[PDB]
Amino acid sequence: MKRTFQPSVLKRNRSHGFRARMATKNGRQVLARRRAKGRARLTVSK
Amino acid sequence: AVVKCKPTSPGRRHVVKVVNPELHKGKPFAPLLEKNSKSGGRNNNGRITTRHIGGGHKQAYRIVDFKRNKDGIPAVVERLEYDPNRSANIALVLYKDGERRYILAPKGLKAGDQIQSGVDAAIKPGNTLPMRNIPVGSTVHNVEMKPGKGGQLARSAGTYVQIVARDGAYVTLRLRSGEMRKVEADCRATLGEVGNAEHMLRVLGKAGAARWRGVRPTVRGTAMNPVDHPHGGGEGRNFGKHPVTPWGVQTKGKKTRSNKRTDKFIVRRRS
Amino acid sequence: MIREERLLKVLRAPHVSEKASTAMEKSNTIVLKVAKDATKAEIKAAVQKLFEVEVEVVNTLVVKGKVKRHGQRIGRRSDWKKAYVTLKEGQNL
RNA sequence: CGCCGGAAGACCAAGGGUUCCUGUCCAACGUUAAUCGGGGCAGGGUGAGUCGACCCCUAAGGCGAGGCCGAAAGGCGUAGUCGAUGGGAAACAGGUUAAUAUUCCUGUACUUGGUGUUACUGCGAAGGGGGGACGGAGAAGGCUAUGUUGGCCGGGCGACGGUUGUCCCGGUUUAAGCGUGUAGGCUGGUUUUCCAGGCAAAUCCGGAAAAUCAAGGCUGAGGCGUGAUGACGAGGCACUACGGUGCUGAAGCAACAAAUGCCCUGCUUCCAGGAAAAGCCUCUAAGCAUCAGGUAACAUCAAAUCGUACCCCAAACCGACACAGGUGGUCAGGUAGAGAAUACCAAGGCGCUUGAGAGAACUCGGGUGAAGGAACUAGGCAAAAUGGUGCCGUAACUUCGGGAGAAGGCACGCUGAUAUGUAGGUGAGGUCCCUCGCGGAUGGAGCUGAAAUCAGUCGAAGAUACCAGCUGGCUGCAACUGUUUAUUAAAAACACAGCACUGUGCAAACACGAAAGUGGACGUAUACGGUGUGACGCCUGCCCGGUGCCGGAAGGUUAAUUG
RNA sequence: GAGGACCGAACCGACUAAUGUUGAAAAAUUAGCGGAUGACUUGUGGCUGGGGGUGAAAGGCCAAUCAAACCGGGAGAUAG
Ligand SMILES: [Mg+2]
Ligand SMILES: [Mg+2]
Ligand SMILES: [Mg+2]
Ligand SMILES: [Mg+2]
Ligand SMILES: [Mg+2]
Ligand SMILES: [Mg+2]
Ligand SMILES: [Mg+2]
Ligand SMILES: [Mg+2]
Ligand SMILES: [Mg+2]
Ligand SMILES: [Mg+2]
Ligand SMILES: [Mg+2]
Ligand SMILES: [Mg+2]
Ligand SMILES: [Mg+2]
Ligand SMILES: [Mg+2]
Ligand SMILES: [Mg+2]
Ligand SMILES: [Mg+2]
Ligand SMILES: [Mg+2]
Ligand SMILES: [Mg+2]
Ligand SMILES: [Mg+2]
Ligand SMILES: [Mg+2]
Ligand SMILES: [Mg+2]
Ligand SMILES: [Mg+2]
Ligand SMILES: [Mg+2]
Ligand SMILES: [Mg+2]
Ligand SMILES: [Mg+2]
Ligand SMILES: [Mg+2]
Ligand SMILES: [Mg+2]
Ligand SMILES: [Mg+2]
Ligand SMILES: [Mg+2]
Ligand SMILES: [Mg+2]
Ligand SMILES: [Mg+2]
Ligand SMILES: [Mg+2]
Ligand SMILES: [Mg+2]
Ligand SMILES: [Mg+2]
Ligand SMILES: [Mg+2]
Ligand SMILES: [Mg+2]
Ligand SMILES: [Mg+2]
Ligand SMILES: [Mg+2]
Ligand SMILES: [Mg+2]
Ligand SMILES: [Mg+2]
Ligand SMILES: [Mg+2]
Ligand SMILES: [Mg+2]
Ligand SMILES: [Mg+2]
Ligand SMILES: [Mg+2]
Ligand SMILES: [Mg+2]
Ligand SMILES: [Mg+2]
Ligand SMILES: [Mg+2]
Ligand SMILES: [Mg+2]
Ligand SMILES: [Mg+2]
Ligand SMILES: [Mg+2]
Ligand SMILES: [Mg+2]
């Protein structure tokens, strides 16, 4: 059966990539929270 | 002509189609075409603002001359053409100076007829004149409501307007809806009436024929659940309420015109 | 031209392997580890200046570093560029 | 030996990321053992002017200088700028690695730029025009891929009767490019004058009027030649470090069949009327006129960067698994067959990572069954049965189309003859003509080849396997095709064409929006929205007291305000 | 050579039965079944956001999640 995760790196970067997060002020707060928590990987990337 | 298809299929039994052998069998005039992308009834918020719109055949927009402001210069009709963007047919005219334009094809017009706009044009179907130069009682179409703005009234297939009275700077018109309206005399109109009058005789015949025209199905409000529509649910078929729009406004009778700006031009409302 | 200070940095090491050896004795081609950002123009000028030979054409490719596992932790070796430098017929090294 | 073979083979995209190859190891991992592995460890491996990306160009859409709007955050949007799933220059065959190759090598090509010289020369865009540039369906003509047979070449003479022949086995391959402009498709051609159009200008486009010529131009599969005295090539002969390596190398034709591929972005036809922009061609303005710049020839230089291994009905992707699931595109051999169904095979790939015995009940999946034949059961659930082609024949009813494959029946293999292979298809040589060629006419060799009739003949059975409708009668509901509760409901539910009422005069009603605005619609009452009904046929009666809606404006009552 | 035409593979679907039900599988397999030129199907990309979307309407669907998604917070809600 067709499961929910059908990967596509183009759609992955356009939806959750770094520049997508930096576009809006809400996405920038996501990066702020993740930097504060000390995440090793801020966003989806290679 | 109006022809009924033979019932070789349940979907073809009731089809009644309109054939016109004088329509151009070929490609339209390229320099007068534009891209006309569909919308699905969505506005710039991406929300459905008009239900039951979607799909249908791809269509290219024909730039129709509704202003007819090329006065003095005669023009000849090259051919009548099918236009998917409107119910009427359009005529490709060729002016004496070499310009080609698209106009609404009036009734009786055919390839080779000569038309002209301006205050000096002859009174005959296809000519465009300011309404103060048109005899009272005549039948016109493609009427402007502001001078130089472009025709906005009586553009559908078979429609027309008759000038019933003229006084001062205004003329009174009887619209196809039966409403008497005042329009200032400097507005333009085209003599005659819009062609393709038998457009209303067609029968689509099957559900798919409406889908080709970009019309999605209409779900009756009484078939929904109470959360979806005021006509709600009920065990079985229950109505027990006054008919309303999906947003609760009473339909079947309630007048919704609220425009005090243009009331001075309405001589008498339709009835 | 290209500055010699730049040329003295693009060549890193001569790649030694079975394929590199047969390419040397069957097609007169040397295989070199070059700088990651080196272009075919820079590699050609550097070999002709430092090794004093005549270069016909340069083919390059980027080698992806392997993901190795040191004890219990995983690491990844660096990527590096490999160059196939073809010399003229009457040249040696 | 068995299995797949429109896949369980081959190749891309996506996604994964070293799983690829070699050496080595067997703790853990592998549903067992493991010397093996997609496991551990080490080493190796991805070569591009032409493939892809990047790049140029835009679609939906995104963002958006100013701008408009909004308590703030922000919303919308102009100029713009991004955004492929689409448009845009160019390479093929052979060889080679343990692992890459249209990338390396060999041979033979091509494209776009830069610079230079020479010859000729009105160039010039953020503008104009052209072009790019476009639907569905259908038809059948020409082809090719490809296959079959013959010929040719090489080999063979048979473990058991026969097998020097009408015998057996194998091979019979060759590209882009360049030249030729064919089947066929489209279009009159040229010159001169004039002109309210293409925002200005225009020699261009459009329009008008003349004269003249009638064949000119564009497009175009394939064939043919060349590419190629080459390469490849059955095999043979050498070595083998027994995997391979080296050397040599015959024929390399014709006929027929033939695509869902190509001509074809064509032709015909229909209505539901079928992207954009750039590259490209052309036109001039400003401007530049020695120049600059353009066209042509030759020379020379440049074509960067990134991707390139491996897996893809998969043990490597999505499913927690080495999971009977899901996963877009390309390729499409033989015999039978209408066929991409099905059966058996080729190329190629596999036997599905526990076995060994035994041959109880019982369960699962199947086979057969005396006599009976729905007595079973909520119910013919399941099973059995029917099943093909041709011909004959076919009811009520009907909206005249249907119903209908109604029902029912007959024939069906093989051999011979008609006819040493017919009708038909294909078409050589020859001959003739030609305004000469990839020409026309005639001509029929050769090849291919149904269907039918008659006679004979075998079996219990000839649509023999796989494959492949059960049929009829009465009736409810819904007209129909379609849609729906992903994961217990597919229906009489929803939709539907049609009908009616009602709103709506355009800055439309209405909807999304504190707003700007957007949809409705680049539409205009033969239009649009809402509501109910639901093809068609015959029809749709009475009630306006209640509730709602519409109209009315006299009177009564009545808010802020006023005081 | 018309058709939301007919028969029937791919493809899409899911009517019946059996199996399975600590499954091979958190919805499948096997044998039959419906549509199969269209209101068809499919790839890539895009848009619509939670009292909101979308819905040929089942309260269906909106990441194995739905009569109001998920995540964090109010929050140690309150619990005769
Ligand atoms: Mg997304
Ligand atoms: Mg309706
Ligand atoms: Mg319901
Ligand atoms: Mg309600
Ligand atoms: Mg009831
Ligand atoms: Mg090279
Ligand atoms: Mg490279
Ligand atoms: Mg590894
Ligand atoms: Mg391996
Ligand atoms: Mg073990
Ligand atoms: Mg390994
Ligand atoms: Mg701003
Ligand atoms: Mg914006
Ligand atoms: Mg761009
Ligand atoms: Mg390989
Ligand atoms: Mg242009
Ligand atoms: Mg052939
Ligand atoms: Mg023998
Ligand atoms: Mg013998
Ligand atoms: Mg011709
Ligand atoms: Mg590669
Ligand atoms: Mg590869
Ligand atoms: Mg593969
Ligand atoms: Mg496979
Ligand atoms: Mg699997
Ligand atoms: Mg699929
Ligand atoms: Mg098969
Ligand atoms: Mg047994
Ligand atoms: Mg029995
Ligand atoms: Mg019996
Ligand atoms: Mg019986
Ligand atoms: Mg009984
Ligand atoms: Mg009983
Ligand atoms: Mg049954
Ligand atoms: Mg059966
Ligand atoms: Mg007989
Ligand atoms: Mg009853
Ligand atoms: Mg029905
Ligand atoms: Mg149905
Ligand atoms: Mg269900
Ligand atoms: Mg069901
Ligand atoms: Mg009644
Ligand atoms: Mg009132
Ligand atoms: Mg059908
Ligand atoms: Mg079918
Ligand atoms: Mg099945
Ligand atoms: Mg059917
Ligand atoms: Mg309910
Ligand atoms: Mg869910
Ligand atoms: Mg609190
Ligand atoms: Mg608590």
Swiss-Prot record, chain A:
- Taxonomic placement: Bacteria, Pseudomonadati, Pseudomonadota, Gammaproteobacteria, Enterobacterales
Q: Output this protein's name.
A: Large ribosomal subunit protein bL34
Which Pfam families does the UniProt record give? Answer: Ribosomal_L34
Concerning its family, UniProt says:
Belongs to the bacterial ribosomal protein bL34 family.
Residue ranges of the TM segments: none
**What GO cellular-component annotations does this UniProt entry give?**
cytoplasm; cytosolic large ribosomal subunit
What's one GO BP annotation on this UniProt entry? cytoplasmic translation
Output the Gene Ontology terms for molecular function: structural constituent of ribosome
Question: What gene does the UniProt entry assign to this protein?
Answer: rpmH
Assembly and interaction partners: Part of the 50S ribosomal subunit.
Which UniProt key words apply to this protein? Answer: Ribonucleoprotein, Ribosomal protein
Where on the tree of life does the source sit, at the highest rank? Bacteria
Identify the InterPro entries for this entry: Ribosomal_bL34, Ribosomal_bL34_CS
From Swiss-Prot, chain B:
Q: Which GO terms describe its cellular component?
A: cytoplasm; cytosol; cytosolic large ribosomal subunit; DnaA-L2 complex
- Biased segments, Low complexity type: 38-47
Source organism, top-level taxon: Bacteria
Q: Which GO terms describe its molecular function?
A: RNA binding; rRNA binding; structural constituent of ribosome; transferase activity; zinc ion binding
Q: List-wise, which residues carry N6-acetyllysine?
A: K241
Q: Which UniProt keywords apply?
A: Acetylation, Ribonucleoprotein, Ribosomal protein, RNA-binding, rRNA-binding
Output the PANTHER family linked to this UniProt entry.
LARGE RIBOSOMAL SUBUNIT PROTEIN UL2M (PTHR13691:SF5), RIBOSOMAL PROTEIN L2 (PTHR13691)
Q: Which family does it belong to?
A: Belongs to the universal ribosomal protein uL2 family.
Its function, per the record, reads:
One of the primary rRNA binding proteins. Located near the base of the L1 stalk, it is probably also mobile. Required for association of the 30S and 50S subunits to form the 70S ribosome, for tRNA binding and peptide bond formation. It has been suggested to have peptidyltransferase activity; this is highly controversial.
The record's misc note reads: This protein can be partially replaced in vivo by its H.marismortui (HmaL2) or human (L8, from the 60S cytoplasmic ribosome) homolog.
Spell out the protein name for this chain: Large ribosomal subunit protein uL2
The record lists the organism as Escherichia coli (strain K12)
UniProtKB/Swiss-Prot annotation, chain C:
Quaternary state and interactors? Part of the 50S ribosomal subunit. Contacts protein L29 and trigger factor. Might also contact SecE and probably does contact SecG and SecY when the SecYEG translocation complex is docked with the ribosome.
Q: Which family does it belong to?
A: Belongs to the universal ribosomal protein uL23 family.
Q: What does this protein do?
A: One of the early assembly proteins, it binds 23S rRNA; is essential for growth. One of the proteins that surround the polypeptide exit tunnel on the outside of the subunit. Acts as the docking site for trigger factor for Ffh binding to the ribosome (SRP54) and to nascent polypeptide chains.
The effect annotated for E18Q is: Strongly reduces trigger factor binding
Its protein name is Large ribosomal subunit protein uL23
InterPro entries on file: Nucleotide-bd_a/b_plait_sf, Ribosomal_uL23-like, Ribosomal_uL23/eL15/eS24_sf, Ribosomal_uL23_CS
Q: Which GO terms describe its biological process?
A: cytoplasmic translation; ribosomal large subunit assembly
GO MF, one term, reads: rRNA binding
Q: Which UniProt keywords apply?
A: Ribonucleoprotein, Ribosomal protein, RNA-binding, rRNA-binding
HAMAP family this protein is in?
Answer: Ribosomal_uL23_B
The record ties this protein, via Pfam families, to: Ribosomal_L23
Annotated Gene Ontology cellular components are: cytoplasm; cytosolic large ribosomal subunit
Query: Is Ribonucleoprotein one of the keywords?
Result: yes
SUPFAM superfamilies (alphabetical): Ribosomal proteins S24e, L23 and L15e
Q: Does the keyword DNA-binding apply?
A: no
